[PDB]
Amino acid sequence: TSWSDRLQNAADMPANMDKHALKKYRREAYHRVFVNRSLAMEKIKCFGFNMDYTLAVYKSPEYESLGFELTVERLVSIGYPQELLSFAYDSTFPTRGLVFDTLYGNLLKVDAYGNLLVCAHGFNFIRGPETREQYPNKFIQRDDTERFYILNTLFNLPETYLLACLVDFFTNCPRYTSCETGFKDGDLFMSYRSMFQDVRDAVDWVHYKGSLKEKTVENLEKYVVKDGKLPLLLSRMKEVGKVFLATNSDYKYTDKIMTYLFDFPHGPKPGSSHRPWQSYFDLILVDARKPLFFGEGTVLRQVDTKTGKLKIGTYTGPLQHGIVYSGGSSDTICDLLGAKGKDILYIGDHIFGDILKSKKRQGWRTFLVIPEFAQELHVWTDKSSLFEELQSLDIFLAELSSIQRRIKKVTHDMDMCYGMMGSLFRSGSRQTLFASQVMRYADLYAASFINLLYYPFSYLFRAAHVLMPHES
Amino acid sequence: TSWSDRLQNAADMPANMDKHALKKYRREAYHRVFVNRSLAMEKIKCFGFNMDYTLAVYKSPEYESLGFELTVERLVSIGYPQELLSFAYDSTFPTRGLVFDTLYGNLLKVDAYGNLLVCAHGFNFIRGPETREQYPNKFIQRDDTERFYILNTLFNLPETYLLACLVDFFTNCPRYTSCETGFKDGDLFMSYRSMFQDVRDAVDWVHYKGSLKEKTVENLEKYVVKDGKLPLLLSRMKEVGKVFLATNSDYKYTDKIMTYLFDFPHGPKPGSSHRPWQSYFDLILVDARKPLFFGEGTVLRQVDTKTGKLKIGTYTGPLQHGIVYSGGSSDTICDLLGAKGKDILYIGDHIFGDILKSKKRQGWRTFLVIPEFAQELHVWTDKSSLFEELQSLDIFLAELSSIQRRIKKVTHDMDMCYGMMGSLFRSGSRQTLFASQVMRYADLYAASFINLLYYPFSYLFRAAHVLMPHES
Amino acid sequence: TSWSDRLQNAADMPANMDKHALKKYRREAYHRVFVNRSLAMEKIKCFGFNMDYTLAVYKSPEYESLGFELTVERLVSIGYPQELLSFAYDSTFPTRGLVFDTLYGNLLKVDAYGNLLVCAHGFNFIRGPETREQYPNKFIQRDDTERFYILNTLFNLPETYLLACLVDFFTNCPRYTSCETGFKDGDLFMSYRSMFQDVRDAVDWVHYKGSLKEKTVENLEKYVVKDGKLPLLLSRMKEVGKVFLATNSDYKYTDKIMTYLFDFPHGPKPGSSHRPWQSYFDLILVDARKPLFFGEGTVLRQVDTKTGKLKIGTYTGPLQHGIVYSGGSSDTICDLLGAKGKDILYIGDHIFGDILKSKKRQGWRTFLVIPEFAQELHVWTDKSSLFEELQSLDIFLAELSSIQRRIKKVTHDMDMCYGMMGSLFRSGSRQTLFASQVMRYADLYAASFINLLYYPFSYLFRAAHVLMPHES
Amino acid sequence: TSWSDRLQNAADMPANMDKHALKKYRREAYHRVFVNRSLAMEKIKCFGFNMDYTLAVYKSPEYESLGFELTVERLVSIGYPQELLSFAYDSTFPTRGLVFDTLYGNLLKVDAYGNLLVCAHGFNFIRGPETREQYPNKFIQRDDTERFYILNTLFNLPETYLLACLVDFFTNCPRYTSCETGFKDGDLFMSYRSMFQDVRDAVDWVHYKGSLKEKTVENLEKYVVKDGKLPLLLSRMKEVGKVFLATNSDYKYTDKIMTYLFDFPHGPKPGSSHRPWQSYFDLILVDARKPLFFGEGTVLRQVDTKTGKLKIGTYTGPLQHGIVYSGGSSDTICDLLGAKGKDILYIGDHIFGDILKSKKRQGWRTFLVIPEFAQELHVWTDKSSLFEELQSLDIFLAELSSIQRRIKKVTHDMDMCYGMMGSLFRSGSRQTLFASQVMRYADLYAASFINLLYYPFSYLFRAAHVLMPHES
Ligand SMILES: Nc1ncnc2c1ncn2[C@@H]1O[C@H](COP(=O)(O)OP(=O)(O)OP(=O)(O)O)[C@@H](O)[C@H]1O
Ligand SMILES: Nc1ncnc2c1ncn2[C@@H]1O[C@H](COP(=O)(O)OP(=O)(O)OP(=O)(O)O)[C@@H](O)[C@H]1O
Ligand SMILES: Nc1ncnc2c1ncn2[C@@H]1O[C@H](COP(=O)(O)OP(=O)(O)OP(=O)(O)O)[C@@H](O)[C@H]1O
Ligand SMILES: Nc1ncnc2c1ncn2[C@@H]1O[C@H](COP(=O)(O)OP(=O)(O)OP(=O)(O)O)[C@@H](O)[C@H]1O
């Protein structure tokens, strides 16, 4: 049971729009919208979306394995050894949000302060004392972006695992000599940094020049979650405000995916005429180039929706029915829809490029979709006893040696229930950088934005006020 | 009664080192150390200090008025109108941490998200609806550092007030025509941006080329808080670890100020031989150039402590008794003291240049001194009824029009008890950017670091664990 | 008769190595090496080459027309109008070295000071007075590289003509409205700058992702000059020094072209065994990335000459027989060959990326190949009477109105003998930027480096010393 | 007899404005204007000047020694050793235009290609073979501006000598150990780079914060050449065009110097009423900040000519009689005077900041004043026999070992007649970078712009056309 199994299970259920059924449904944690800062939904005048892993949730582990397989094949194609073909994607290893240290070739799980929570070299999980040789302060400088790469997105899950496979493979292959910063192969030296760049380039290649999109579109049922409640919720949003799409993907791929997402023998509700996906949007913008989109952006272009090609020149005209934009900036959207930032609820899955940047650069309201959250929630509630014991040990240790070794043991057993790299949100009692960024920049979050269907449009999402220590 | 009156009052009390007297003393909020993240003092091996507003707390409002007067005189000296000489510093106007908007000439109090809490043009406090003409989303882009300047330090309190005096003066003087972005004076246009730069340059000039330091040193009793408990606490720190000074000030001024701070007819305790201030430090570093200090820093130099001049060349030698450094970097300190970041408690007053940067760049532990906090605490406890009523109104409004107008009225009455720009930490129920940065980057904070004297060196400072909404 | 016709004509002649025959052959201007700075050939220890338009001279106008056709087809493929397919390359329009002004859409021929010599908007040649509206000082700022693009290479001849075709087409097509800085097409605006970037991108695409290389290699006799004297001269160079290749092209294409260049039923001389092209080189380096090559360069890689792919990792080994390098820097070559800069004669066709940069960055000696020079020389000698009359008019005008109008008329008639954009080297009595860069940075120049065959290896190439006005 | 002795000698002669006397006077080389590019004076509509070493020629060696003495005193004041006070400026050592190599501490005389002509470490002149250890290719990369500093101006003559004094002093002082890149002094290391920066900072300090200007103005007869022909030539320029001043100096100093320059008991000619210096200028601009002046420049300000202070704000008004500008850009001048670049003859002494930059950035016509040229001309004509012998040896050596050693010997004897660093313009038969920049960017040059007085305003300055080798 993967996280996308939970989501597709909830997607196969028709929407019971009885007012009592909704209030009861959103009592379960899997259907709730969780709130970091209070948000009065009645003030939202525009609902904005990205597409990938938000409207189009790619099924797991099939999609990650496809991306992994095509990336491995690209690396072999450019000269990596044939043994890469023996790799097989393993969804229990990677957790999202890890940091690859290109100097020493380690995957790191860190908190918001750069403190080390987990350190794996290949598949070898390095314990505290051994990490101090490379990390004397158990700490990394997050601003050293040349050295450290944060694997933010679900698209990064294949390469997260692949980086560890590669370090593991070169380390244990007798043709290579392991050095502090890479591998020696006779008169060739492969640094972890250049290896990382090859992987990163191959993932980009797979997405932009390879066959990933083609293989996705030829088997959409295998790769993309489909939910009849999606047209219903969007149609309700359009009744109370405006709806826009702003995706980094190109129009041809967006058209294929969105057509599939809306391919039901009916419109918003069973019994209604089917409507094209574009009719659900007041504004459609592709090739957004987020997060640059939230600053100067790029030149605003017009898509020829017949050919899927850009028309030649900068588009200077108005928002017209049927027009599709390419590029532009977030100001394009606000001007064309007559919106201010706080009028907008932007619904995305990229913690940095969608949520952090729209919040900090423009003061948009934010809803973070966390696709793995359906599975994380299941583990969290099933193992809440382990966490509670952890909280008790920390309290008992505060009043006071065998307690500290028991804290590490419970922490490990809890973390392993999530996978080898632990929970997206914490390791034991220590929060991750990702958890901290969610809390700070996502006003609302959930496994799926479809959970908004279970709340009335006048709903006041409420968070407790934050107080300083001296104020409480 | 200024905030420095509270501090000097607590400074005139001898230290009662009875173990029960300490535990009782630190029960009062004015003597507590407040905790944002747990910190086991037994792990601290090095105590580091800045000097200005930490070891040398400048008395208020005398010091701010002196800085104001010399800045006004410098501006008049370079050609500003004689009417500036009629200005008089007013400590009830400025609050620290405001943002000057150089485009429109406004002082802004903002939260961590750039939302507007207060907007004053000159001395005219602009209400919500009128601010939307210039701030359509009631929001500023904090990354637009060319436009927005954050007035972080107590040294910025004179210019905070002076900026408002100047906007007020040019606005109401018939020789000038007010425009959106500055003032027209015939064939001369003075933008708010160039006016701001003149003020900023004049404050720098006053500090580096003017008479401020000279006038301070000639009347240290008037301008600098003096506390016999300072040598005692530093001496206790040196018994359990190492002690270092890292100040942006030059050696000649540091020597004068520190000599005064230690000028008692005794050493750490009454009855003990007096010791020179330098003997309290394992490492003394001046001209630190923080925050660059916490990255590449500058070339490490050696001070000739006889002449107060730098010796010629880069210093390549070891840490020797009596040596004084200039420049260098935070790595200089860690290498020379054999410390890792988390071994260090760095005690400073600059939320950005001392605390944020040492935390994020180096993983140092941090203690933020907030000199005005003595007065803020007094107002907070005296007016806790107003805040409680505010909390109740927000709760009552959440279950549900005359409540919202009452919320704004209580918010104003509460804020005015702090001064015209309100509390350093909030406006009503909304936290400031400064409060958020304190919580995120200051592990400990207090009105004075002397409050550490009331805690044993094995003390475990404890903060509650942070949980995400779905985890609680 | 194109310039490559002259070259291939001289290539079909076997080499007469009789000492008197050589001295007599190099008396004709078409076989001379011309000298800007004295160079003692006996001091040259390494002969270095680029490949494109130096070793592999592409036949004209066939190769330019092929590049033009594929670029037009790429532009139409991305959405430019079908009328582009009616364009046909015209070798009489473009001269190399013109500057495209992306602001106003003009092709400019300039001198080294940025003075305007010729200005064409589309195919409309703008006369002096009309150019002053856009160029008030008849002058462009050459450092404004965002605005002005210098079309340095023969590869730029197709796009030189295509830019003029496009400006001409959009200007005279009634669907578009001509504006100062581009064309309006309803709600789309196409600036000259974005049009230029489309052209530039399409030329790059044609070379790197399109079919240009493929179409060249499938008909090498049509597209590439072949000369049996090339293996002979290289073999003689290797007898007295070292020989290296440093090309921006990739190994697969280099191998195909060079194999063709050496595909004779014999080696250096008729009767000798054929040798593979690689045997003529002590060092072979592809993917050079000049001019960055002459600074930090890129990571040094090793080519797997079986697969044509790079081996994985940085190459740390020594110069071995049969090894082929990729990337690296000019220091790679100097270290591996044990050469200092002035030991090296580098033979290239890129006035900026080969000659200027190797001279200024490294102090290499330089030989500039100018493929069109064979034709320019023919016109120069045939029309020397027109130039002489021009020199006389300038002298007569200096002793003194109908003379000035006659100077412009002779200047035009002379220039048109070269083509519509005149001589590569001048317009009338005014030298071009290209001529000035040749004189300053090319120690030697000729239509072909094969002209070195007509000089003994001890030859002292001599240039007259330059004197200041007061020194003569 | 210094170069300023020649100039002041020619300045003490009244102007004989008889038409025949002028034509005869400008036959002597000392009164000629030398021509690199033809210039029709009738086309010049604006004459522009800098002040320092152009209008105000500082007497030699008195002014250089004053600058040297104050710089040494500043260095000692900040901690350099007392032995510096034993230095005495020596005008026979420095030549203008040398390059200080901050890596190895050498003064270099180079040609335009970075080839080494002279290399002195301290006062030790390093011969060819010994220079190859540090300069393997006898070549420096001129674009390595962090390493190499070109000493362009006469203001740099004191520090040119001082750098050599310092290297000499530290090398031969037993307290210091000489290393490749600087000097070790126990636990202090002084790199040549930081030593150079101290010198550069001290020269700036002397000019901007020290007593150099004050000491100059208190004895103007000692320090500044005064010529009654200066008001006459400027008055004649104003009769045929406009005249402007654009100086990097401030107004207070400009006013003092210019008042002295015009302090005669008469105006342009004996017998005429004296006029204030400002009346000779249509436009006066101080604080120009050249060469940035020739790009974006700085904010245009207005000088209050009563107080010598800037008025507050940007000046938006028109060119008015009596107005004085500060800052701005070259476009300010062109707009206000209604001039295009080629209408302007700009007369300056800074080969880079005045001449090169105004030529390349704006297409101004240029006149380079070379104050030492009066003395260089004397030596050139007196030793023309040595140069002729040198030319003969080079020719004789071209037809062909004892000739080459005789070429070096004649080259040395010729160079030493100019000073220890040889001629500004060459070393033997090799031209300097400075000579090359003069030829390329100075349309006209002379020891003084006063030489323009000997030419009628319709004069056509003529230079021979430049031809490529194949064109002649
Ligand atoms: N999740 C992320 N993905 C990619 N880049 C990020 C992410 N978070 C931060 N960055 C960027 O990485 C750089 C270094 O981050 P740094 O920790 O210095 O600042 P920060 O993110 O503001 O830290 P904090 O979380 O303490 O606010 C910054 O430019 C920041 O914008
Ligand atoms: N108190 C401060 N004083 C001066 N500069 C600051 C302060 N706080 C942040 N900055 C700097 O101002 C710039 C813009 O801040 P921005 O809000 O973009 O990032 P941030 O400070 O990381 O935000 P956040 O508080 O959301 O983490 C950044 O370079 C940041 O480091
Ligand atoms: N033929 C060329 N092709 C491409 N870029 C060039 C060429 N010639 C010069 N450049 C670059 O264009 C920029 C602007 O040239 P600019 O005229 O400012 O300097 P320059 O080339 O040194 O001039 P000069 O010819 O007077 O020496 C510089 O960075 C220069 O290196
Ligand atoms: N006399 C000078 N003084 C100061 N800087 C200079 C001088 N001459 C050139 N420069 C600057 O130094 C840098 C390096 O010069 P470089 O030799 O790379 O270019 P260049 O001056 O165009 O050379 P060339 O003389 O061959 O045209 C450039 O930015 C150039 O503008």
* Among A108, A139, A143, residue to substitute to test ligand 1 (most atoms within 8 Å of Cβ): A143
* Among C141, C142, C143, C360, residue to substitute to test ligand 4 (most atoms within 8 Å of Cβ): C360
Helices (H), D120-191: 128-131, 157-172
Long-range pairs, C58-61, Cβ under 8 A, ≥24: C58/C4, C58/C154, C58/C216, C58/C223, C58/C224, C58/C225, C59/C2, C59/C4, C59/C8, C59/C222, C59/C223, C59/C224, C59/C225, C60/C2, C60/C3, C60/C4, C60/C5, C60/C91, C60/C371, C60/C372, C61/C2, C61/C89, C61/C91
- Contact residues on chain D for C394, CB-CB shorter than 8 A: 465
Name the resolution in angstroms. Answer: 2.1
Cα separation of A57 and A73, whole Å? 24
* The two three-digit tokens of residue D413, written as one number: 């004897």
Name the residue at shortest CA distance from atom 14 of ligand 2.
B143
Domains of chain D by start residue, with CATH:
38-58+224-369 (3.40.50.1000), 62-217 (no CATH)
Q: Is A231 helix (H, G, I), strand (E, B) or coil?
A: helix
Cβ A193 vs Cβ A103: under 8 Å: yes
Interface test with A, best of C178, C188, C299 (most A CBs within 10 A): C188
Cα separation of C259 and C265, whole Å? 12
Q: How many CA atoms lie within 13 A of A6 on its CB side?
A: 17
Is some CB atom of chain B closer than 8 A to the CB atom of A414?
A: no
* Among B115, B141, B143, residue to substitute to test ligand 2 (most atoms within 8 Å of Cβ): B143
Residue C307: CB atoms within 10 Å? 11
Burial class (CB in 10 A: 0-12, 13-18, 19+), D373: buried
Of C6, B415, B374, the C-alpha closest to A470 is B374
* The two three-digit tokens of residue C255, written as one number: 């191998």
Residue C366: CB atoms within 10 Å? 27
Cα separation of C460 and C38, whole Å? 7
B 105-124: CB under 8 A from A: 113-115
Name the residue at shortest CA distance from atom 15 of ligand 2.
B143
Closest residue to D189, CB basis, from B187, B304, B316: B316
> D398 and C435: CB-CB below 8 Å?
no
Per the DSSP assignment, residues forming a β-bridge with A33 are none
Give the DSSP H or E segment for D106: strand D106-110
β-sheet with A309-310: strand ranges across? A34-35, A444-446, A365-369, A344-348, A46-49, A242-246, A283-286, A325-327, A300-304, A309-310
- Contact residues on chain A for C188, CB-CB shorter than 8 A: 302, 311-316
Cβ D414 vs Cβ D383: under 8 Å: yes
Cα separation values, B74 from B105, B338, C110, Å: 21, 45, 52
> D313 and B78: CB-CB below 8 Å?
no
- Contact residues on chain A for B29, CB-CB shorter than 8 A: 470
Name the residue at shortest CA distance from atom 19 of ligand 4.
D143
Is some CB atom of chain C closer than 8 A to the CB atom of A175?
A: no
Query: Which residue shows structure tokens 């002096």?
Result: C128
Residues in chain D: 472
Q: How far B311 CA sits from the closest chain D CA (Å)?
A: 7
Cβ B258 vs Cβ B55: under 8 Å: yes
Name the residue at shortest CA distance from atom 29 of ligand 2.
B143
- Contact residues on chain B for D315, CB-CB shorter than 8 A: 187-188
Taking the CA atoms of C316, C320, C322 and C326 in sequence, report the sign of the dihedral they define: positive
Q: Is A270 helix (H, G, I), strand (E, B) or coil?
A: coil
User: Which ligand minimizes its atom distance to the CA of B441?
Assistant: 1
Cα separation of C459 and C6, whole Å? 26
Find the distance separating the first CA and the last CA of chain B, reported in whole Å: 44
Helices (H), B132-250: 157-172, 192-208, 212-217, 220-223, 229-240
Q: Are strands D182-185 and A365-369 parallel, antiparallel or unpaired?
A: unpaired
Residue B295 CB less than 6 A away from ligand 1: no
Nearest atom, ligand 2, residue B142 CA: 17
Per the DSSP assignment, residues forming a β-bridge with B6 are none
Phi, psi of B150 (to 5 degrees): -85, 125
B 306-345: CB under 8 A from D: 307, 309-318
Maximum separation of any 2 CA atoms in chain D, in Å? 72
Q: Please tell me whether the peptide bond between D61 and the residue prior to it is cis, using omega within 30 degrees of 0.
A: yes
Helix axes B402-416, B384-399, angle to 10 degrees: 160
Taking the CA atoms of A338, A342, A344 and A348 in sequence, report the sign of the dihedral they define: positive
Closest residue to D316, CB basis, from B80, B187, B310: B187
Is some CB atom of chain D closer than 8 A to the CB atom of B1?
A: no
Burial class (CB in 10 A: 0-12, 13-18, 19+), A34: buried
Beta strands in D9-82 (DSSP E): 34-35, 39-40, 46-49
Q: How far A191 CA sits from the closest chain C CA (Å)?
A: 7
Is some CB atom of chain D closer than 8 A to the CB atom of C396?
A: no
Cα separation values, D320 from B115, C32, C179, D240, D315, Å: 47, 63, 37, 20, 12
Counts of helices then strands in chain C (DSSP H, E):
16, 23
Q: Is A428 helix (H, G, I), strand (E, B) or coil?
A: coil
Helices (H), B14-156: 19-25, 62-77, 128-131
Cβ B396 vs Cβ B348: under 8 Å: no
- Contact residues on chain B for D326, CB-CB shorter than 8 A: none
Cα separation of D347 and D367, whole Å? 5
Which are the contacts of D230, defined by CB distance < 8 A and separation ≥ 6? Answer: D55, D261, D262, D450
Cα separation of C195 and C166, whole Å? 9
Which DSSP state fits A368? E
Query: Which residue shows structure tokens 């949003």?
Result: A237
- Contact residues on chain A for C190, CB-CB shorter than 8 A: 312-314
β-sheet with D148-150: strand ranges across? D124-125, D116-121, D106-110, D99-101, D148-150
Name the residue at shortest CA distance from atom 6 of ligand 2.
B352
Is some CB atom of chain C closer than 8 A to the CB atom of A78?
A: yes
Cα separation values, C425 from C370, C388, D163, Å: 11, 16, 45
Q: Please tell me whether the peptide bond between B61 and the residue prior to it is cis, using omega within 30 degrees of 0.
A: yes
Cα separation of A108 and D224, whole Å? 70
User: Which ligand minimizes its atom distance to the CA of B361?
Assistant: 1
- Contact residues on chain A for C305, CB-CB shorter than 8 A: none
> C189 and A310: CB-CB below 8 Å?
no
Amino acid in the structure at residue D67: G
Cβ C3 vs Cβ C375: under 8 Å: yes
Using CB distances shorter than 6 Å, the residues near ligand 3 are C 112, 142-143, 145, 150, 152, 351-352, 437; D 360
Of B329, B305, B325, the C-alpha closest to B315 is B325
> A137 and B342: CB-CB below 8 Å?
yes
